[PDB]
Amino acid sequence: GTSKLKYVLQDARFFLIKSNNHENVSLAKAKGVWSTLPVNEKKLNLAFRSARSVILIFSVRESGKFQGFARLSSESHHGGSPIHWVLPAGMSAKMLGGVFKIDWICRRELPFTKSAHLTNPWNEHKPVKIGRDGQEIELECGTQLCLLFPPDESIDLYQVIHKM
Ligand SMILES: CNC(=O)c1n[nH]c2ccc(I)cc12
């Protein structure tokens, strides 16, 4: 069913995450973590205090798809176990901020062809697939986008609901 999912998304905030490569999304799915640039880290930390749920919707650049979505379970923190993120070219991971803990809500993919009817008011009503890393997605568009994903029957949202 979709009822617990709708409860988790009620009055949520949504952010588009653009990963440079599939390796980083695979690490995030395995370890329940994400890290971003300080400009976006500050936005996500503000949002985490401001909303019942903050949802990250992931898309690997040039893949033509979203790879799933997850809910922040913490503000960013430093000093944890290192994560061997992959960065394009020889760019240094030192530019990243802290680490957010996340709980995956859906690990299934969704092709951009299926979200063509959704526009994001916070990005000039462009199709929701279009946006820089960290672009906020307005509530209604973000909710409908998450509801388009195939159900992920491996996930039990009972534990997530307890964290709200
Ligand atoms: C695991 N997160 C990243 O690798 C990442 N997040 N935002 C970015 C902006 C520029 C570059 I180069 C890399 C990133």
Coordinates of N, CA, C and O and ligand atoms in Angstrom, one line a residue:
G1 N 0.8 -1.2 0.0 CA 0.0 0.0 0.0 C 0.8 1.3 0.0 O 2.1 1.2 0.1
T2 N 0.2 2.4 -0.1 CA 0.8 3.7 -0.1 C 0.5 4.6 1.1 O 1.0 5.8 1.1
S3 N -0.2 4.1 2.0 CA -0.7 5.0 3.1 C 0.4 5.4 4.0 O 0.5 6.6 4.4
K4 N 1.2 4.5 4.5 CA 2.3 4.9 5.3 C 3.3 5.8 4.6 O 3.8 6.8 5.2
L5 N 3.5 5.6 3.3 CA 4.3 6.5 2.5 C 3.8 7.9 2.4 O 4.5 8.9 2.7
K6 N 2.5 8.0 2.2 CA 1.8 9.3 2.2 C 2.0 10.0 3.6 O 2.1 11.2 3.7
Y7 N 1.9 9.2 4.7 CA 2.0 9.8 6.0 C 3.4 10.4 6.2 O 3.6 11.5 6.7
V8 N 4.5 9.6 5.7 CA 5.8 10.1 5.8 C 6.0 11.4 5.0 O 6.8 12.3 5.4
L9 N 5.4 11.5 3.8 CA 5.6 12.6 3.0 C 4.7 13.8 3.3 O 4.9 14.9 2.8
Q10 N 3.8 13.7 4.3 CA 2.9 14.8 4.6 C 3.7 15.9 5.2 O 4.5 15.8 6.1
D11 N 3.5 17.1 4.5 CA 4.2 18.3 4.9 C 5.7 18.2 4.9 O 6.4 18.9 5.6
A12 N 6.2 17.3 4.0 CA 7.7 17.2 3.9 C 8.3 18.3 3.0 O 7.5 19.0 2.3
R13 N 9.6 18.4 3.1 CA 10.4 19.1 2.1 C 11.2 18.2 1.3 O 11.5 17.1 1.8
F14 N 11.5 18.6 0.0 CA 12.1 17.7 -1.0 C 13.2 18.4 -1.6 O 13.1 19.6 -2.0
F15 N 14.3 17.7 -1.8 CA 15.5 18.3 -2.5 C 16.0 17.3 -3.5 O 16.1 16.1 -3.3
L16 N 16.3 17.8 -4.7 CA 16.9 17.0 -5.8 C 18.4 16.9 -5.5 O 19.1 17.9 -5.3
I17 N 18.9 15.7 -5.5 CA 20.3 15.4 -5.4 C 20.8 14.8 -6.7 O 20.3 13.8 -7.2
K18 N 21.9 15.5 -7.2 CA 22.4 15.1 -8.5 C 23.8 14.5 -8.2 O 24.8 15.2 -7.9
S19 N 23.9 13.2 -8.3 CA 25.1 12.5 -8.1 C 25.9 12.4 -9.4 O 25.4 12.1 -10.4
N20 N 27.3 12.6 -9.3 CA 28.1 12.5 -10.4 C 28.2 11.1 -11.0 O 28.5 11.0 -12.2
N21 N 28.0 10.1 -10.2 CA 28.3 8.7 -10.6 C 27.4 7.8 -9.9 O 26.8 8.1 -8.8
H22 N 27.3 6.5 -10.4 CA 26.5 5.5 -9.7 C 27.1 5.0 -8.4 O 26.4 4.6 -7.5
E23 N 28.5 5.1 -8.4 CA 29.2 4.6 -7.2 C 28.7 5.3 -5.9 O 28.5 4.7 -4.9
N24 N 28.5 6.6 -6.0 CA 28.1 7.3 -4.8 C 26.7 7.0 -4.3 O 26.4 6.9 -3.1
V25 N 25.8 6.7 -5.3 CA 24.5 6.3 -4.9 C 24.5 4.9 -4.3 O 23.8 4.6 -3.3
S26 N 25.3 4.0 -4.8 CA 25.5 2.7 -4.3 C 26.0 2.8 -2.8 O 25.5 2.1 -2.0
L27 N 27.0 3.6 -2.6 CA 27.5 3.8 -1.2 C 26.4 4.3 -0.3 O 26.3 3.9 0.9
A28 N 25.6 5.3 -0.8 CA 24.6 5.9 0.0 C 23.5 4.9 0.4 O 23.0 4.8 1.5
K29 N 23.2 4.0 -0.6 CA 22.2 2.9 -0.4 C 22.7 1.9 0.6 O 21.9 1.3 1.4
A30 N 24.0 1.6 0.6 CA 24.5 0.5 1.4 C 24.7 1.0 2.8 O 24.5 0.3 3.8
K31 N 25.2 2.3 3.0 CA 25.6 2.8 4.3 C 24.6 3.8 4.9 O 24.8 4.1 6.1
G32 N 23.6 4.2 4.2 CA 22.6 5.1 4.8 C 23.2 6.5 5.1 O 22.9 7.0 6.1
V33 N 23.9 7.1 4.1 CA 24.6 8.3 4.4 C 24.6 9.1 3.1 O 24.5 8.6 2.0
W34 N 24.7 10.4 3.3 CA 25.0 11.3 2.1 C 25.8 12.5 2.6 O 25.8 12.9 3.8
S35 N 26.6 13.0 1.7 CA 27.4 14.2 2.0 C 27.4 15.1 0.7 O 27.3 14.6 -0.4
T36 N 27.4 16.4 1.0 CA 27.2 17.4 -0.1 C 28.1 18.6 0.1 O 28.8 18.7 1.2
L37 N 28.1 19.6 -0.8 CA 28.9 20.8 -0.6 C 28.3 21.6 0.5 O 27.1 21.6 0.8
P38 N 29.2 22.4 1.2 CA 28.7 23.2 2.3 C 27.5 24.1 2.0 O 26.6 24.3 2.8
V39 N 27.4 24.7 0.8 CA 26.2 25.5 0.4 C 25.0 24.7 0.5 O 23.9 25.2 1.0
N40 N 25.0 23.5 0.1 CA 23.8 22.6 0.2 C 23.6 22.0 1.6 O 22.5 21.8 2.0
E41 N 24.7 21.7 2.2 CA 24.7 21.2 3.6 C 23.9 22.2 4.5 O 23.1 21.8 5.3
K42 N 24.3 23.5 4.4 CA 23.6 24.5 5.2 C 22.1 24.5 4.9 O 21.2 24.6 5.8
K43 N 21.7 24.4 3.6 CA 20.3 24.4 3.3 C 19.6 23.1 3.9 O 18.5 23.2 4.4
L44 N 20.2 22.0 3.8 CA 19.6 20.8 4.3 C 19.5 20.8 5.8 O 18.5 20.2 6.4
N45 N 20.5 21.3 6.5 CA 20.4 21.4 8.0 C 19.3 22.3 8.4 O 18.5 22.0 9.3
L46 N 19.1 23.5 7.7 CA 18.0 24.4 8.0 C 16.7 23.6 7.8 O 15.8 23.7 8.6
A47 N 16.6 22.9 6.6 CA 15.4 22.2 6.3 C 15.1 21.1 7.4 O 13.9 20.9 7.7
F48 N 16.1 20.4 7.8 CA 15.9 19.3 8.8 C 15.2 19.8 10.1 O 14.4 19.0 10.7
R49 N 15.5 21.0 10.5 CA 14.9 21.5 11.7 C 13.5 22.1 11.4 O 12.7 22.3 12.4
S50 N 13.2 22.3 10.2 CA 12.0 23.1 9.8 C 10.8 22.2 9.4 O 9.7 22.7 9.2
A51 N 11.0 20.9 9.2 CA 10.0 20.0 8.6 C 10.0 18.7 9.2 O 11.0 18.2 9.7
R52 N 8.8 18.0 9.2 CA 8.7 16.7 9.8 C 9.5 15.7 9.1 O 10.0 14.7 9.7
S53 N 9.7 15.8 7.7 CA 10.5 15.0 6.9 C 11.2 15.8 5.9 O 10.6 16.6 5.2
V54 N 12.5 15.5 5.7 CA 13.3 16.1 4.5 C 13.6 14.9 3.6 O 14.3 14.0 4.1
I55 N 13.2 15.0 2.4 CA 13.4 13.9 1.4 C 14.4 14.3 0.4 O 14.3 15.4 -0.2
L56 N 15.4 13.4 0.2 CA 16.4 13.6 -0.9 C 16.0 12.6 -2.0 O 15.8 11.4 -1.8
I57 N 15.8 13.2 -3.2 CA 15.5 12.4 -4.4 C 16.7 12.4 -5.3 O 17.2 13.5 -5.8
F58 N 17.3 11.2 -5.6 CA 18.6 11.0 -6.2 C 18.5 10.8 -7.7 O 17.7 10.0 -8.1
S59 N 19.4 11.5 -8.4 CA 19.5 11.2 -9.8 C 21.0 11.2 -10.2 O 21.7 12.2 -10.0
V60 N 21.5 10.1 -10.8 CA 22.8 10.1 -11.3 C 22.9 10.9 -12.7 O 22.1 10.6 -13.6
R61 N 23.8 11.8 -12.8 CA 23.9 12.7 -14.0 C 24.0 11.8 -15.2 O 24.7 10.8 -15.2
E62 N 23.3 12.2 -16.3 CA 23.3 11.5 -17.6 C 22.6 10.2 -17.6 O 22.6 9.5 -18.6
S63 N 22.1 9.7 -16.5 CA 21.5 8.4 -16.4 C 20.0 8.4 -17.0 O 19.5 7.3 -17.3
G64 N 19.4 9.6 -17.1 CA 18.1 9.7 -17.5 C 17.0 9.1 -16.5 O 15.9 8.9 -16.9
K65 N 17.4 9.0 -15.3 CA 16.6 8.3 -14.3 C 16.8 8.9 -12.9 O 17.9 9.5 -12.7
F66 N 15.9 8.8 -12.0 CA 16.1 8.9 -10.6 C 16.4 7.5 -10.0 O 15.9 6.5 -10.5
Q67 N 17.2 7.4 -9.0 CA 17.6 6.1 -8.4 C 17.0 5.8 -7.1 O 17.2 4.7 -6.5
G68 N 16.1 6.7 -6.6 CA 15.4 6.4 -5.4 C 15.3 7.6 -4.6 O 15.7 8.7 -5.0
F69 N 14.7 7.5 -3.4 CA 14.6 8.6 -2.4 C 14.7 8.1 -1.0 O 14.4 7.0 -0.6
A70 N 15.1 9.1 -0.1 CA 15.5 8.8 1.2 C 15.1 10.0 2.1 O 15.0 11.1 1.6
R71 N 15.0 9.7 3.4 CA 14.6 10.8 4.4 C 15.8 11.0 5.3 O 16.4 10.1 5.8
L72 N 16.2 12.3 5.5 CA 17.2 12.6 6.4 C 16.8 12.2 7.8 O 15.6 12.4 8.3
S73 N 17.7 11.5 8.5 CA 17.4 11.1 9.9 C 18.3 12.0 10.9 O 18.1 11.9 12.1
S74 N 19.2 12.8 10.4 CA 20.0 13.6 11.2 C 20.5 14.8 10.4 O 20.4 14.9 9.2
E75 N 20.9 15.9 11.2 CA 21.7 16.9 10.6 C 23.1 16.4 10.2 O 23.4 15.3 10.6
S76 N 23.8 17.2 9.5 CA 25.2 16.7 9.1 C 26.1 16.7 10.4 O 26.0 17.5 11.3
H77 N 27.0 15.7 10.4 CA 28.0 15.6 11.4 C 29.3 15.2 10.8 O 29.4 14.6 9.8
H78 N 30.4 15.7 11.5 CA 31.8 15.4 11.1 C 32.4 14.4 12.1 O 31.8 14.1 13.2
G79 N 33.4 13.7 11.7 CA 34.2 12.8 12.5 C 33.7 11.4 12.6 O 34.2 10.7 13.5
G80 N 32.9 11.0 11.7 CA 32.5 9.6 11.6 C 33.5 8.8 10.8 O 34.6 9.2 10.5
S81 N 33.1 7.5 10.5 CA 33.9 6.7 9.7 C 34.0 7.3 8.3 O 33.0 7.7 7.7
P82 N 35.2 7.3 7.7 CA 35.3 7.9 6.4 C 34.5 7.1 5.3 O 34.3 5.9 5.4
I83 N 34.0 7.9 4.4 CA 33.3 7.3 3.2 C 34.1 7.7 2.0 O 34.4 8.8 1.7
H84 N 34.4 6.6 1.2 CA 35.2 6.8 0.0 C 34.4 7.2 -1.2 O 34.4 6.5 -2.2
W85 N 33.8 8.4 -1.1 CA 33.1 8.9 -2.2 C 34.0 9.0 -3.5 O 35.2 9.2 -3.4
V86 N 33.4 8.9 -4.6 CA 34.1 9.1 -5.9 C 33.8 10.5 -6.4 O 32.6 10.9 -6.5
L87 N 34.8 11.2 -6.8 CA 34.6 12.5 -7.3 C 35.2 12.6 -8.7 O 36.2 12.0 -9.0
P88 N 34.5 13.3 -9.7 CA 35.0 13.3 -11.1 C 36.4 13.9 -11.1 O 36.8 14.8 -10.3
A89 N 37.2 13.5 -12.1 CA 38.6 13.9 -12.2 C 39.3 13.6 -10.9 O 38.9 12.7 -10.1
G90 N 40.4 14.3 -10.7 CA 41.1 14.1 -9.4 C 40.7 15.2 -8.4 O 41.6 15.7 -7.6
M91 N 39.4 15.4 -8.3 CA 38.9 16.4 -7.3 C 38.9 15.9 -5.9 O 38.5 14.7 -5.7
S92 N 39.2 16.7 -4.9 CA 39.4 16.3 -3.6 C 38.0 16.2 -2.8 O 37.2 17.2 -2.9
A93 N 37.8 15.2 -2.0 CA 36.7 15.0 -1.1 C 36.7 16.0 0.0 O 35.7 16.2 0.7
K94 N 37.9 16.7 0.2 CA 37.9 17.7 1.3 C 37.0 18.8 1.2 O 36.6 19.5 2.1
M95 N 36.5 19.1 -0.1 CA 35.5 20.1 -0.3 C 34.2 19.8 0.2 O 33.3 20.7 0.4
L96 N 33.9 18.5 0.6 CA 32.6 18.1 1.1 C 32.4 18.6 2.5 O 33.4 18.8 3.2
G97 N 31.2 18.7 2.9 CA 30.8 19.0 4.3 C 30.7 17.8 5.2 O 31.4 16.8 4.9
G98 N 29.9 17.9 6.2 CA 29.6 16.7 7.0 C 28.8 15.7 6.4 O 28.5 15.7 5.2
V99 N 28.4 14.7 7.2 CA 27.7 13.5 6.7 C 26.3 13.5 7.3 O 26.1 13.6 8.5
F100 N 25.3 13.3 6.5 CA 23.9 13.1 6.9 C 23.6 11.6 7.0 O 23.9 10.9 6.0
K101 N 23.0 11.2 8.0 CA 22.4 9.9 8.1 C 21.0 10.0 7.4 O 20.2 10.9 7.6
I102 N 20.7 8.9 6.6 CA 19.5 8.9 5.8 C 18.8 7.5 6.0 O 19.6 6.5 6.1
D103 N 17.5 7.4 5.9 CA 16.8 6.2 5.8 C 16.1 6.1 4.4 O 15.4 7.0 4.0
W104 N 16.5 5.0 3.7 CA 15.9 4.9 2.4 C 14.4 4.6 2.4 O 13.9 3.8 3.3
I105 N 13.6 5.2 1.5 CA 12.2 5.0 1.5 C 11.9 4.2 0.2 O 11.0 3.3 0.2
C106 N 12.7 4.4 -0.9 CA 12.6 3.6 -2.1 C 13.9 3.5 -2.7 O 14.6 4.6 -3.0
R107 N 14.4 2.3 -3.0 CA 15.7 2.1 -3.7 C 15.5 1.7 -5.2 O 16.4 1.4 -5.8
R108 N 14.2 1.8 -5.7 CA 13.9 1.5 -7.1 C 14.1 2.8 -7.9 O 14.0 3.9 -7.4
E109 N 14.4 2.6 -9.2 CA 14.6 3.7 -10.1 C 13.3 4.1 -10.8 O 12.3 3.4 -10.8
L110 N 13.3 5.4 -11.3 CA 12.2 5.9 -12.0 C 12.8 6.7 -13.2 O 13.5 7.6 -13.0
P111 N 12.4 6.3 -14.5 CA 12.9 7.0 -15.6 C 12.3 8.4 -15.8 O 11.1 8.6 -15.4
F112 N 13.0 9.4 -16.3 CA 12.5 10.7 -16.5 C 11.3 10.8 -17.4 O 10.4 11.7 -17.2
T113 N 11.2 9.8 -18.3 CA 10.0 9.8 -19.2 C 8.7 9.7 -18.4 O 7.7 10.2 -18.8
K114 N 8.7 9.1 -17.2 CA 7.5 9.0 -16.4 C 7.2 10.2 -15.5 O 6.1 10.3 -15.0
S115 N 8.1 11.2 -15.4 CA 7.9 12.4 -14.6 C 7.7 13.6 -15.5 O 7.7 14.7 -14.9
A116 N 7.5 13.4 -16.8 CA 7.5 14.6 -17.7 C 6.3 15.5 -17.4 O 6.3 16.6 -17.9
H117 N 5.3 15.0 -16.7 CA 4.1 15.8 -16.4 C 4.2 16.7 -15.2 O 3.3 17.4 -14.8
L118 N 5.4 16.6 -14.5 CA 5.6 17.3 -13.2 C 6.6 18.4 -13.4 O 7.7 18.2 -13.9
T119 N 6.1 19.6 -13.1 CA 7.0 20.8 -13.1 C 7.2 21.3 -11.7 O 6.3 21.2 -10.8
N120 N 8.4 21.9 -11.5 CA 8.8 22.4 -10.1 C 8.6 23.9 -10.1 O 9.4 24.6 -10.8
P121 N 7.7 24.4 -9.4 CA 7.5 25.9 -9.2 C 8.8 26.6 -8.8 O 9.0 27.8 -9.1
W122 N 9.6 26.0 -8.0 CA 10.8 26.6 -7.4 C 12.0 26.6 -8.4 O 13.1 27.1 -8.1
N123 N 11.8 26.0 -9.6 CA 12.8 26.0 -10.7 C 12.0 26.5 -12.0 O 12.2 25.8 -13.0
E124 N 11.3 27.6 -11.9 CA 10.6 28.2 -13.1 C 9.7 27.3 -13.8 O 9.4 27.4 -15.0
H125 N 9.1 26.3 -13.0 CA 8.1 25.4 -13.6 C 8.7 24.5 -14.7 O 8.0 24.0 -15.6
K126 N 10.0 24.3 -14.7 CA 10.7 23.4 -15.5 C 10.4 22.0 -15.1 O 10.0 21.8 -13.9
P127 N 10.5 21.0 -15.9 CA 10.3 19.6 -15.5 C 11.2 19.3 -14.3 O 12.3 19.7 -14.3
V128 N 10.6 18.5 -13.4 CA 11.2 18.3 -12.1 C 12.6 17.6 -12.2 O 13.5 17.8 -11.4
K129 N 12.8 16.8 -13.3 CA 14.1 16.3 -13.6 C 15.2 17.3 -13.7 O 16.4 17.0 -13.5
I130 N 14.9 18.5 -14.1 CA 15.8 19.6 -14.3 C 16.1 20.3 -13.0 O 15.2 20.8 -12.4
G131 N 17.4 20.4 -12.7 CA 17.8 21.2 -11.5 C 19.2 21.0 -11.1 O 19.7 19.9 -11.3
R132 N 19.8 22.0 -10.5 CA 21.1 21.8 -9.9 C 21.0 20.9 -8.7 O 20.0 20.6 -8.2
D133 N 22.2 20.3 -8.3 CA 22.3 19.6 -7.1 C 21.8 20.5 -5.9 O 22.3 21.6 -5.8
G134 N 20.9 20.0 -5.2 CA 20.4 20.7 -4.0 C 19.1 21.5 -4.3 O 18.6 22.2 -3.4
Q135 N 18.6 21.5 -5.6 CA 17.4 22.3 -5.9 C 16.2 21.8 -5.1 O 15.9 20.6 -5.0
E136 N 15.5 22.7 -4.4 CA 14.4 22.3 -3.7 C 13.2 22.1 -4.6 O 13.0 22.8 -5.6
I137 N 12.4 21.1 -4.3 CA 11.2 20.7 -5.1 C 10.0 21.0 -4.2 O 9.9 20.5 -3.1
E138 N 9.1 21.9 -4.7 CA 7.9 22.3 -4.0 C 7.1 21.0 -3.6 O 7.0 20.0 -4.2
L139 N 6.3 21.2 -2.4 CA 5.6 20.1 -1.8 C 4.8 19.2 -2.7 O 4.9 18.0 -2.7
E140 N 3.9 19.9 -3.5 CA 3.0 19.1 -4.3 C 3.7 18.3 -5.4 O 3.5 17.1 -5.6
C141 N 4.6 19.0 -6.1 CA 5.4 18.3 -7.1 C 6.3 17.2 -6.5 O 6.3 16.0 -7.0
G142 N 6.9 17.5 -5.4 CA 7.8 16.4 -4.7 C 7.0 15.2 -4.3 O 7.4 14.1 -4.4
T143 N 5.8 15.5 -3.7 CA 4.9 14.4 -3.3 C 4.5 13.5 -4.5 O 4.6 12.3 -4.5
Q144 N 4.0 14.1 -5.6 CA 3.6 13.4 -6.7 C 4.8 12.6 -7.4 O 4.6 11.5 -7.8
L145 N 6.0 13.2 -7.4 CA 7.2 12.5 -7.9 C 7.5 11.3 -7.1 O 7.6 10.2 -7.7
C146 N 7.5 11.4 -5.8 CA 7.8 10.2 -5.0 C 6.7 9.1 -5.2 O 7.0 7.9 -5.1
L147 N 5.4 9.5 -5.3 CA 4.4 8.5 -5.5 C 4.5 7.8 -6.9 O 3.8 6.8 -7.0
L148 N 5.2 8.4 -7.8 CA 5.4 7.7 -9.1 C 6.3 6.5 -9.0 O 6.2 5.6 -9.9
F149 N 7.3 6.5 -8.1 CA 8.2 5.4 -8.0 C 7.5 4.1 -7.8 O 6.5 4.0 -7.2
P150 N 8.1 3.0 -8.4 CA 7.5 1.7 -8.1 C 7.6 1.4 -6.6 O 8.6 1.9 -5.9
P151 N 6.7 0.7 -6.0 CA 6.8 0.4 -4.6 C 8.0 -0.4 -4.3 O 8.4 -1.3 -5.1
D152 N 8.6 -0.2 -3.2 CA 9.8 -0.9 -2.7 C 9.4 -1.8 -1.6 O 9.3 -1.3 -0.4
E153 N 9.0 -3.0 -1.9 CA 8.5 -4.0 -0.9 C 9.5 -4.5 0.1 O 9.1 -5.2 1.0
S154 N 10.8 -4.1 -0.1 CA 11.8 -4.5 0.9 C 11.8 -3.5 2.1 O 12.5 -3.8 3.1
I155 N 11.1 -2.4 2.0 CA 11.2 -1.4 3.0 C 9.9 -1.4 3.9 O 8.8 -1.5 3.4
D156 N 10.1 -1.2 5.2 CA 9.0 -1.1 6.2 C 9.1 0.3 6.8 O 10.1 0.6 7.5
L157 N 8.1 1.1 6.5 CA 8.2 2.5 6.9 C 7.8 2.7 8.4 O 7.8 3.8 8.9
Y158 N 7.4 1.6 9.1 CA 7.0 1.7 10.5 C 8.2 2.4 11.3 O 7.9 3.3 12.1
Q159 N 9.4 1.9 11.1 CA 10.6 2.5 11.8 C 10.8 3.9 11.5 O 11.1 4.7 12.4
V160 N 10.6 4.3 10.2 CA 10.7 5.7 9.9 C 9.7 6.6 10.6 O 10.0 7.7 11.1
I161 N 8.4 6.1 10.6 CA 7.3 6.9 11.2 C 7.7 7.2 12.7 O 7.4 8.3 13.2
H162 N 8.3 6.3 13.4 CA 8.7 6.5 14.8 C 9.7 7.6 14.9 O 9.7 8.3 16.0
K163 N 10.5 7.9 13.9 CA 11.5 8.9 14.0 C 10.9 10.3 13.9 O 11.6 11.3 14.2
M164 N 9.7 10.4 13.3 CA 9.1 11.7 13.1 C 8.5 12.2 14.4 O 8.7 13.4 14.8
Ligands
LIG1 C1 28.8 12.4 -2.2 N1 28.6 13.8 -2.7 C2 29.4 14.4 -3.7 O1 30.3 13.8 -4.2 C3 29.1 15.8 -4.1 N2 28.0 16.5 -3.6 N3 28.0 17.7 -4.2 C4 29.0 17.9 -5.0 C5 29.4 19.0 -5.8 C6 30.5 18.9 -6.6 C7 31.3 17.7 -6.6 I1 33.0 17.6 -7.9 C8 30.9 16.6 -5.8 C9 29.8 16.7 -5.0

